[PDB]
Structures are given as structure tokens and as C-alpha cells.
Amino acid sequence: MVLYFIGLGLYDERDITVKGLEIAKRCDYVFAEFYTSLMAGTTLGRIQKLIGKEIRVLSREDVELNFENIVLPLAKENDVAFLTPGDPLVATTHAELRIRAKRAGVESYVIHAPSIYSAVGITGLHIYKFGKSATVAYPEGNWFPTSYYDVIKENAERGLHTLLFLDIKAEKRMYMTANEAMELLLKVEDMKKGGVFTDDTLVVVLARAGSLNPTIRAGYVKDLIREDFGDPPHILIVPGKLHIVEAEYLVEIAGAPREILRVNV
Amino acid sequence: MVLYFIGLGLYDERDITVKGLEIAKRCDYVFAEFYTSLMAGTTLGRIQKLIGKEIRVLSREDVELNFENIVLPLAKENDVAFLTPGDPLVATTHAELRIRAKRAGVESYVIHAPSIYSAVGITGLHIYKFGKSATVAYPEGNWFPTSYYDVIKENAERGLHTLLFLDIKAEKRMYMTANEAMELLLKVEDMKKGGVFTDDTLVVVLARAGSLNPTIRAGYVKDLIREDFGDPPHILIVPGKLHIVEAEYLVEIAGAPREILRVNV
Numbered sequence: 356m357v358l359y360f361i362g363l364g365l366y367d368e369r370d371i372t373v374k375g376l377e378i379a380k381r382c383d384y385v386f387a388e389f390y391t392s393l394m395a396g397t398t399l400g401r402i403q404k405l406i407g408k409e410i411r412v413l414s415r416e417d418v419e420l421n422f423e424n425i426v427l428p429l430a431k432e433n434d435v436a437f438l439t440p441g442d443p444l445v446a447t448t449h450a451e452l453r454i455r456a457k458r459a460g461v462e463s464y465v466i467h468a469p470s471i472y473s474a475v476g477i478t479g480l481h482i483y484k485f486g487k488s489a490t491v492a493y494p495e496g497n498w499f500p501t502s503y504y505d506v507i508k509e510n511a512e513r514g515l516h517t518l519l520f521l522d523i524k525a526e527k528r529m530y531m532t533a534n535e536a537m538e539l540l541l542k543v544e545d546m547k548k549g550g551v552f553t554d555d556t557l558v559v560v561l562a563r564a565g566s567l568n569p570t571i572r573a574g575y576v577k578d579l580i581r582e583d584f585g586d587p588p589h590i591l592i593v594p595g596k597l598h599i600v601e602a603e604y605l606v607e608i609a610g611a612p613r614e615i616l617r618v619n620v
Numbered sequence: 621m622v623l624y625f626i627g628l629g630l631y632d633e634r635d636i637t638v639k640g641l642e643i644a645k646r647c648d649y650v651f652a653e654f655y656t657s658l659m660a661g662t663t664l665g666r667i668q669k670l671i672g673k674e675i676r677v678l679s680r681e682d683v684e685l686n687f688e689n690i691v692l693p694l695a696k697e698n699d700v701a702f703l704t705p706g707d708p709l710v711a712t713t714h715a716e717l718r719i720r721a722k723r724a725g726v727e728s729y730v731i732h733a734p735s736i737y738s739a740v741g742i743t744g745l746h747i748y749k750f751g752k753s754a755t756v757a758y759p760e761g762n763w764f765p766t767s768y769y770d771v772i773k774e775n776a777e778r779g780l781h782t783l784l785f786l787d788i789k790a791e792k793r794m795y796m797t798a799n800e801a802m803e804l805l806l807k808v809e810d811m812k813k814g815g816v817f818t819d820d821t822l823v824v825v826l827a828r829a830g831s832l833n834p835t836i837r838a839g840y841v842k843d844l845i846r847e848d849f850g851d852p853p854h855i856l857i858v859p860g861k862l863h864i865v866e867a868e869y870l871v872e873i874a875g876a877p878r879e880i881l882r883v884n885v
């Protein structure tokens with residue numbers, strides 16, 4: 356008589372919270388989606404082993420078009436869980452699924468898990484200083500998305516940092532790298548010419564957050580644009596004006612150029 | 621030779637991740653701090669029993685002044701864990717501790733966990749629309765801090781949501797309630813007259829995130845200012861203009877009045 360939205364966390368099957376695991380273990384049916392993000396350190400099998408249940412994976416269409424026909428029916432007579440990478444309600448449209456649950460007479464509960472949205476704290480940048488976030492989407496056909504560029508501009512003007520979620524084509528197994536994101540931004544800059552993103556812009560890259568050894572790198576676009584940051588997923592950040600302590604961490608932990616220590620107040 | 625920064629999550633002892641628990645269990649020494657925030661749904665005793673290790677609590681002074689004399693020495697020759705509420709490094713002062721570790725010749729790794737910063741996704745508000753964050757501090761003596769009011773103004777002005785962390789006297793375990801925060805903001809408004817926070821302002825209250833029964837309420841200040849949102853902790857959010865999908869979730873899940881579907885969209 357219930358539906359649980361349970362996050363699996365950032366990188367592997369152990370990133371699920373103890374709360375989420377104990378609840379999942381007792382559910383009658385377990386569903387999941389793996390298109391909203393990439394968990395690079397585990398497999399469906401390892402997750403199934405940990406929870407001790409068979410997991411039915413749903414596609415974007417299964418969820419967005421038939422969540423109420425595939426999941427909710429069973430939730431009316433059983434305890435059902437719906438697993439997702441990271442936190443189920445961060446940078447996804449899953450929140451609306453709670454309304455479908457309500458209209459189907461199914462109570463729903465949310466179990467949080469580590470999210471990339473807060474994990475960026477590991478870059479040393481103050482979390483409260485992050486402004487509006489955006490997603491760098493792959494251009495398609497004659498369409499070239501550029502809204503993420505304006506987000507950076509607006510935040511930077513306020514001295515805020517910008518978190519850039521990178522695109523993902525789960526079914527095609529394509530995961531945008533920070534390198535590709537940088538290349539796209541430089542092209543948008545050539546078009547709008549707002550001096551927002553150039554070869555001299557300081558950026559931070561975080562790859563495989565959640566693993567024990569994620570790649571954390573800070574430096575100028577000209578220097579990092581061709582650097583190997585390892586396997587996906589990747590996230591790109593364009594810092595605003597830095598506090599001295601943020602610069603110190605970027606230098607000491609993320610290998611940034613020591614010159615950024617000399618902040619221009 | 622290794623120091624592990626492990627997040628305890630949102631509310632109780634089960635909000636730690638499976639990864640964090642297993643690592644904490646195999647650590648020779650386990651330290652923890654409860655000054656950046658508290659774990660309202662559990663106790664030190666319950667956390668200790670779960671980890672199966674003695675936990676030495678450290679004060680703000682122990683950490684800020686003597687982290688390198690209390691924690692690092694043992695981490696130099698043993699596996700040491702440093703537990704913190706929420707997600708490690710979201711609190712601004714945590715990051716610097718990794719630099720101290722580096723200088724002492726000690727390796728450090730971060731084990732993430734759910735943070736209120738990302739858990740607000742349960743309010744139905746799109747995470748990318750959250751702007752700069754702020755903390756509402758209790759005024760005292762002749763000191764009346766109001767920077768948090770300006771943060772709301774700047775965010776709402778750009779159509780962004782404002783997450784307001786509420787003050788907490790960790791040592792005395794005193795939590796500021798959403799009600800007190802609303803009263804304070806009305807007080808600041810009466811002072812600055814910026815038309816930023818009034819009886820007609822739409823707000824969202826999230827209490828006990830992480831719990832299976834959090835209180836999620838949305839409505840106008842005039843109606844929520846004296847409402848009972850349950851036990852701590854409380855988080856207050858002043859959303860910017862709403863996407864219809866956000867408004868529908870607030871109405872269906874947070875009990876918001878239908879009026880927001882026309883006034884705040």
C-alpha cells in the first residue's frame with residue numbers, strides 16, 4: 356500500500372543510505388531508472404545483490420508515459436520502490452510522479468541519497484555561493500542550446516558560482532565530458548561575445564564524485580580543455596569571484612595555478 | 621595514514637550511507653562534530669551503537685583550533701573517521717580541514733551523504749532555480765544582521781528561489797523555527813521597506829527532511845506565520861516565480877492554496 360522513491364547516490368551501490376537499503380529490502384517489487392544520471396562504479400547486478408531483489412529497469416518512456424500503468428498498479432496492493440541514481444528529486448522531473456501516486460490512491464515517501472548538487476562541496480567552493488544552475492545540452496540538428504551561457508553570465512555578475520550539469524544520452528550511452536562542455540561554451544562565446552567564457556576563464560571539473568578518488572581539477576580553460584579527466588560522469592563549474600579560502604583549496608587540492616591565490620578584491 | 625570525512629545525512633542514524641557505515645566500522649578511531657548542525661532524529665548513543673565504535677565528539681574550538689593535534693596525529697598511523705551531519709564540506713569551514721590533513725602528510729577521502737541543500741528537492745521546487753543561499757541569524761544585543769533579506773531580494777528579482785538555513789545554537793540545542801524566521805523577515809521588511817517579504821509573500825516550509833514524515837507546507841506568510849510545523853529542524857524557502865509544475869506540486873503535496881496557481885506563476 357505504498358510507493359517509495361529511493362535514491363542510490365553518486366557512484367556505486369553503497370552510496371544508498373542505510374535507511375533506503377533497509378526499506379528496499381522489505382519491498383515486494385523494486386523498479387528503477389538509470390537514464391537521469393550515470394553511476395560509474397557499480398552494475399545492476401551488484402545493486403540487486405545488495406538489496407536482495409530483482410530490479411525491473413524502466414526507460415524514460417516507461418516512466419514519463421506509463422509510470423501509472425507499470426508501477427502504481429502494484430503499489431496499490433504492495434510495498435513498491437522506485438530507485439534512481441543520486442537523489443530522486445534533484446535535476447529530474449520525478450517530483451511530478453508523486454502527484455500520479457496521489458491520484459492513484461497510493462501514499463508515497465522519499466528517501467534521499469548523496470546528490471551531485473551538494474557533492475560539489477568537495478571542490479572547496481562555498482555551497483551558499485552557488486547561484487542558478489544549468490545544463491549543457493548536446494546540440495541537435497540545426498538546434499544549438501545556449502541558455503546555460505546566460506546563466507553563467509547572470510551568476511558571475513553577482514559574484515556567484517555556476518554548476519553546470521552535463522548532458523547524458525543513456526540509451527545511446529553518451530556522457531558529455533567537461534572537455535565537450537568547454538568546447539561548446541567557447542563557441543557560444545564567439546556568438547554572443549559577452550566575455551563570459553574564454554580561454555582565460557577559471558573553471559573547475561569534478562569527475563566521478565562519490566568514488567574514493569574523484570578527479571578534482573581547477574585551472575584555465577585553455578589549459579584544461581584537452582586534459583583527460585577520466586571516465587564520466589563529469590560536472591563543470593564556472594566559479595564567480597573567489598574567497599581567499601576557496602582559492603587556497605583549489606590550489607592545494609585541485610592543482611589550480613598558484614596565481615589565483617592573489618584575488619582581486 | 622588515512623582520514624575519512626563521513627557524512628551522517630539529514631535526520632537520524634540511518635541517514636549515513638552504506639559506504640560511510642562500513643568504512644566507519646573499520647576505522648580505528650571515530651570522531652564527530654555536532655556544531656555545524658545537529659542530527660535531531662537520533663542521539664550520539666544510537667549512532668555509536670550503529671557504528672559499534674566509541675565516538676569522540678569535538679567542539680568548534682577542538683576542530684578550528686586543534687584539529688591537527690586531536691585528529692591528525694592518530695590519522696597519521698591509523699584509519700580515522702570524522703563524522704559530520706549532512707554532506708561533508710557543505711559547511712564552509714570543513715574544506716580547509718583537508719588542507720590541514722595534506723600538510724600533516726595524511727590522506728583524506730570524502731564519503732558523501734544527503735544534504736538539506738539537495739533534499740529541498742522534495743518541496744517540488746526545481747533545484748536549478750535555487751539561487752544564492754543564506755542563513756537567518758537570531759539578532760542579539762545591538763546587533764541586527766539582515767544580509768539574508770538582501771539575498772532573497774536579489775534571487776527573487778531574477779526569478780530564483782532562496783533557501784534559508786535557520787539559526788541553531790548547537791551547543792544549547794536551540795533551533796530557530798520557521799515561525800520565528802517569518803517574524804524576523806517581517807521585522808526586517810518593516811525596516812528596509814523593499815517589498816521583499818510581506819504577509820502576501822508565498823513561502824515554503826520543510827521540517828525534518830530525511831524523516832519518513834517530514835512536514836512540507838506552502839502558503840502565504842499571513843496564514844503560515846503561526847502554524848505548527850512540528851519538531852525541528854525547520855528550513856524556510858522563499859520561492860521566486862513558479863513554473864506551473866512547481867505550483868501544482870505545492871498544491872497537491874504541500875497543501876498550498878489554489879491561489880498560487882494564478883498569483884505566483
Ligand SMILES: Nc1ncnc2c1ncn2[C@@H]1O[C@H](CSCC[C@H](N)C(=O)O)[C@@H](O)[C@H]1O
Pocket residue numbers: 365366391392393440441442443444445446447469470471472519520521522523561562563564565588589590
Ligand atoms: N558522481 C557524479 N560525478 C560527476 N557528475 C555527476 C555525478 N552524478 C551526477 N552528475 C552530473 O549530473 C548529471 C545528471 S543530473 C541528475 C542528478 C541526480 N538526481 C543527483 O542527485 O546527482 C550528469 O550528467 C553529471 O553531469
